[PDB]
Amino acid sequence: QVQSGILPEHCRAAIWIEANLKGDVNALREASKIFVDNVATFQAKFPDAKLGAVVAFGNNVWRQLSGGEGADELKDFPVYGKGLAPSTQYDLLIHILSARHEVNFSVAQAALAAFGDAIDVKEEIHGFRWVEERDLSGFVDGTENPAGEETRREVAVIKDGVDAGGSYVFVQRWEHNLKQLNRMSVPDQEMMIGRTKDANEEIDGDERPVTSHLSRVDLKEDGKGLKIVRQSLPYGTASGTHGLYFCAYCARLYNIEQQLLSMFGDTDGKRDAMLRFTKPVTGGYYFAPSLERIQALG
Amino acid sequence: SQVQSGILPEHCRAAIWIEANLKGDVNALREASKIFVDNVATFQAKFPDAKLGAVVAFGNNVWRQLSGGEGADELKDFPVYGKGLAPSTQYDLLIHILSARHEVNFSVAQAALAAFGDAIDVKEEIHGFRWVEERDLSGFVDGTENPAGEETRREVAVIKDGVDAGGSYVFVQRWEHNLKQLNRMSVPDQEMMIGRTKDANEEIDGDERPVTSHLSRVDLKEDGKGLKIVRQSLPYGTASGTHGLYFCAYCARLYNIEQQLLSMFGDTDGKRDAMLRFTKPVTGGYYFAPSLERIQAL
Ligand code: HEM
Ligand code: HEM
Ligand SMILES: [Mg+2]
Ligand SMILES: [Mg+2]
């Protein structure tokens, strides 16, 4: 029932396509069915790829396609920090991930064929897992991410109601200034992230700055962590633009927003220390329906 | 005389090519090249399962200065062929990294950039990927008649004796495929354009294909002896944006490559390669890849 791209762990490669609707919103109905059917066919042709994909929709298009039912939390991505985190809300998100980039590429071509000239691609980003699953900063990325299908479902997949089997998705492309990073001592970098670099051990929350990344995003409400399922990957070229393509799924948009309010100064006036070397340049919220809901579009 | 490690490996899944001009004193390339090949050895030691190789190669002007004009008798700036049908974008430095792991290639690319630093101006960085069934993005298998096995590939690509023993000539040319234009062609028309059948990759007899077919352009014999080259080309690009083939070939004789270019681009018999109906080259350069010992003697 859940779209196949939310739950797989440890993908080696991904493709994200962000697009605006140029034509009739009804063109997205048949296109989405064709695409998720294509994904199933590719899974059968390439069983070792552990392929999955997600089609997700921006607020205005999803309100139209759903007749206003459900997706109670969905909204256009606002700026956070009054503009520190920009807003680039689009109509359509396609997320493809697997162990084999060459399979992802074929699936992306299938997606473009399905939607045709109804969509205007705003960016297409090819993510790759780097050495030791580290972000390009050199810090391991993923350690506290929900692990195993059971917990990942609990965090990311809506349990009941009209949206059962769906998920909220957030995507935000960051551009790393690695020269600025390399000007910082390793201890300074470690206090910026909140974990040690080589060994990847958490620095005690009582002993690290409240601006450290972990202090910004490891949030609890009455002892209950506001968890999300991250699917982020490095992207780019060594000599040109490079960074992290951040992607997160959650059964509640709330959990993602609270982390963004924290990181970008809205909650307590303090900003994530990572902004000293990297910055976000896109941002969008999308709703990923269940597969049954996609099939019911037309 | 040891060959650089990136010339001979077969069926690499991923590559990075960096093309750059010299910004500073050519003498800066001496230590930088020695650092780079040492870095390559380090990454081979750290990631034995990547089966990494790399090549540093030099354009005519730079190499004439670094070598004092000795050897590399065939090296020259890449000319335009076909009066401009093949454009010329001769740069000073080529770095070619290939392996089983794109993420290791990326680290090696970063090492190259750190070693050469501001002595170079990067003109393009291209990330190649092997596609399904080793097909070019046109859908045709690419590599079938490439020299196979270390012994034959050495014979074709690696200079055997003299001052340049262990070295090789390199040609790189980036192509931009118009897949929409390709898909307007019937499969039989496409097969007459290439000279092999599409699905089964059977060679079409030379008396059964047009003289403009790719194979008729490049499968050249002189007194019965084929003018062989070692191709390392890979697909590159995004599904929605620029995509094509990054063509790369190694040969102990630049002559073999040039004869094929004169054929493809109309200079030999007034006919040109049928592939120009859907794809076009947008860069072109010749480089000399010295032996590893010669790099140590820089
Ligand atoms: C440049 C952008 C980012 C980079 C390089 C980055 C990197 C990291 C690293 C190195 C960790 C520690 C290891 C781990 O547990 O995964 C981490 C953790 C985490 N990140 Fe980020 N991150 C970025 C952006 C974001 C954003 C935008 C959000 C949320 C809106 C976020 C949410 C989280 C969460 C929830 C954790 C787990 C914290 C914990 O419970 O310990 N990250 N990230
Ligand atoms: C868009 C650019 C190109 C594409 C898509 C392409 C594709 C192909 C394909 C599909 C084959 C047949 C399978 C094989 O034997 O590998 C082939 C063969 C070959 N290509 Fe190309 N190629 C391109 C450019 C070039 C260039 C620029 C050269 C030479 C300068 C070249 C030289 C060769 C050679 C020598 C062969 C082997 C021919 C034989 O002996 O049968 N190719 N190529
Ligand atoms: Mg924690
Ligand atoms: Mg032949």
Ligand types: protoporphyrin IX containing FE, magnesium ion
Task: Give a short account of the largest sheet of chain A.
Answer: 6 strands, antiparallel
Report helical residue fraction of chain A: 25-40%
Largest interface (CB < 8 Å): A-B, 23 and 24 residues
Q: What is the count of distinct domains of chain A? A: 1
> Multimeric state of these chains?
homodimer
Structural category of chain A: alpha+beta
How many distinct helices of chain A? 9
- Report the sheet-strand fraction of chain A: 15-25%
Order of helices and strands of chain A: EHEHEHEHEHHHEEEEEHEEH
Gyration radius from CA atoms of chain A, angstroms:
19 Å
Q: How many strands appear in the DSSP assignment of chain A?
A: 12
Shape label of chain A: globular
Cα distance spanning the termini of chain A: 17 Å
Jot down its keywords:
homodimer; 298 residues; alpha+beta; six-stranded antiparallel β-sheet; four-stranded antiparallel β-sheet; 9 helices; 29% helix; 23% strand; globular; binds protoporphyrin IX containing FE; binds magnesium ion; heme (chain B)
Protein described:
The structure is a homodimer of 298-residue chains. By secondary structure, chain A is an alpha+beta fold. Chain A is built from nine helices and twelve strands. In chain A, the strands form three sheets. In chain A, strands 5, 8, 9, 10, 11 and 12 form a six-stranded antiparallel sheet that branches. In chain A, a hairpin with a 5-residue loop joins β9 and β10. One protoporphyrin IX containing FE binds next to β5, α7, β10 and α8 of chain B. Chain A: Heme b 1 binds at residues 141-144, 213, 230, 246.
